[PDB]
Structure 1
Amino acid sequence: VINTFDGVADYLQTYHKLPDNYITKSEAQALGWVASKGNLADVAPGKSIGGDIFSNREGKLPGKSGRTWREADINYTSGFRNSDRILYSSDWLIYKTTDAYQTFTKIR
């Protein structure tokens, strides 16, 4: 149980898996997600959105003819997302943002 960037990295860099509380939008949506509400702590108490894939649809992440990028919410409790997000690359690269994907700074 954790929701910090380094915490997710340590946990993921050690177990090749996201913290025991990260669910993708895919499942969140099929689970019953609604824009005019943005539910989460209700259908998933003590959990956060993350695990999908970030097709670098922003040109703010390093690409390569053979690699993938994924995103995950950061600093969450009970309500909706925010501007803090962490980006983890298939090349073992850790990228973090704080204005909602607007800018981006590398941490590991």
Structure 2
Amino acid sequence: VINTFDGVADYLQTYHKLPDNYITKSEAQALGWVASKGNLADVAPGKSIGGDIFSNREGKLPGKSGRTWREADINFTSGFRNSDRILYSSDWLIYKTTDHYQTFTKIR
């Protein structure tokens, strides 16, 4: 449904939550998603992984006290997960990565 950089970025800045097509790693697991089989589409048709907290362990995203980072998958429709992610802060800063959190660029 809404799973592009601009559609999700704009939905988050406005509704302050992810579109309804997103579930967390946990939620997906409970439903039967097995990462190694790339079956998310078979067990949670029309959904994408999103909403989990991203630690920001390598320090690369801007830090502020009180700020927590969250991640969501972009461009997913079926198969194995890709390398595209949206990173959004508690204060609504939006960043993209298309290299599996190696590097990031500001989008909002």
* TM-score (norm: length of structure 1): 0.92
Q: 5+ residue gaps in structure 1?
A: none
Identify if the C-alpha distance between structure 1 residues 91 and 83 changes in structure 2 by more than 3 Å, giving closer, same or farther: same
> How many pairs align?
108
**Aligned equivalents of 1:30, 1:44: Cα separation in 2:** 10
The alpha-carbon deviation at position 87 of structure 1 amounts to: 0.3
CA shift digits 1:39-83 (9 cap, x unpaired):
211111111011110111221111122111000000111112111
Dislocated runs of 4+, deviation >3 Å? none
Higher helix share: 2
Aligned to 2:93: 93
**Stretch deviating more after TM superposition (14-23 or 27-36):** 27-36
Q: Could you say what the CA RMSD is over the residues aligned between the two structures, in angstroms?
A: 1.2
Aligned to 1:7: 7
* TM-score (norm: length of structure 2): 0.92
Aligned to 2:49: 49
